[PDB]
Amino acid sequence: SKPFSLPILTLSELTNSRFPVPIDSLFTAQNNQVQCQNGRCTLDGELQGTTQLLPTGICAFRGRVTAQINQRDRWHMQLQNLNGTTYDPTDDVPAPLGTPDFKGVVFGMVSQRNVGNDAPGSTRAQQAWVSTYSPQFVPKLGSVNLRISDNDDFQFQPTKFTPVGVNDDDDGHPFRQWELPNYSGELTLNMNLAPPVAPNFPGEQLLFFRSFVPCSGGYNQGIIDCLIPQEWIQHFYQESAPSQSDVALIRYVNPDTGRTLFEAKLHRSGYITVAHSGDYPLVVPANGHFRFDSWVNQFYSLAPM
């Protein structure tokens, strides 16, 4: 069997798998549903949820604007897959890969480049917002609607949305990173979801890779927590190493000193638990990183943090 491994990367050499920014810190959370759809991959390399491989694809959209309606979510964007191929709403996924997996507003920019009969090759770009609370946020069905800055400089042409940050909506719908959008809109149930994750052994908590992402006004901290970073997902996809048991024991090491600072359980479906009680932001040395130790089972007792 090909041996399992992690890439050797410090926290600042890691990308959040749920928003296209670096990891800032590690955080373990008090128990009490975690069911994110980006940043989902098994240790033997099976992508799940809406997870795809490119960091620049996370919370991005690609397609064409085809209509406008007289509502706040004005501009109707018919989606393609991020690689430009035609999107199939009957595929066994929750939504096009890369679609945001939280309730809130994503802010960034839209850009267009004309094709066909109308001024082919002409371009434009401007600030835009996507509300995942919108009744027109129906990416599983094949479209989302955009709010933009200048309604007079926008055409029915090929369009890309590049995310920059997140926020609460100004009408009081809050940014809730653990609440899934309704991918097919009002009165529909989400399907083909990656499953919820939780500790299943006494005294254990989830460990997250945390980023503080940009916000566009107000005091929101911009916290987005992922289960495993994007480079680990990319690595597992390449390696496809067989999982020899349900849990990989991993050690956080300081390579300068060679010491192990703490240990953790990396579960086969792609998340980490540690032995601790209470919310705790880790403050650990900058050169620190995890290494694979050995395969153990679900009932292995971790050294307390």
**How many other β-carbons are positioned within 10 Å of the β-carbon of residue 97?**
23
Please tell me whether residue 292 binds Mg ion under the rule CB under 5 A. yes
Please tell me whether residue 88 binds a copy of itself under the rule CB under 8 A. no
Strands 123-131 and 105-113: antiparallel
- Of 85 and 297, which has the nearer Cβ to a copy of itself? 85
Stretch that binds Mg ion, among 51-59, 113-121, 212-220, 289-297 (CB under 5 A): 289-297
CB 188 within 8 A of CB 5: no
Looking only at residues 176 through 205 of this chain, which bind a copy of itself when binding is defined by CB under 8 A?
A: none
- Of 20 and 288, which has the nearer Cβ to a copy of itself? 20
In sequence order, the 6+-apart residues with CB closer than 8 A to the CB of 121 are: 113, 114
- Of 237 and 292, which has the nearer Cβ to Mg ion? 292
CB 242 within 8 A of CB 46: no
Stretch that binds a copy of itself, among 10-18, 175-183, 189-197, 244-252 (CB under 8 A): 10-18
Binding-residue pattern over the window 58 to 87 for a copy of itself, x denoting contact by CB under 8 A: ------------------------xxx---
Please tell me whether residue 53 binds a copy of itself under the rule CB under 8 A. yes
Identify the DSSP state of 22. B
Longest dimension (CA), the chain: 66
Looking only at residues 6 through 45 of this chain, which bind Mg ion when binding is defined by CB under 5 A?
A: 6
Q: How far apart are CA 284 and CA 282, in angstroms?
A: 6
Least distance in angstroms from the C-beta of 6 to Mg ion:
4
Please tell me whether residue 117 binds a copy of itself under the rule CB under 8 A. no
**Residue 244, CA distances (Å) to 42, 151, 194, 249 in order:** 13, 56, 22, 12
Least distance in angstroms from the C-beta of 23 to a copy of itself:
10
Least distance in angstroms from the C-beta of 31 to Mg ion:
28
Cα dihedral 280/286/287/291 (nearest 10)? 20
Closest CA to 19 of 182, 184, 175, 145: 175
- Interacting residues toward a copy of itself by CB under 8 A: 7-9, 12-13, 15, 20-22, 53-57, 82-84, 107-109, 111, 113, 121-127, 160, 162, 164-165, 212, 214-222, 231, 234, 238
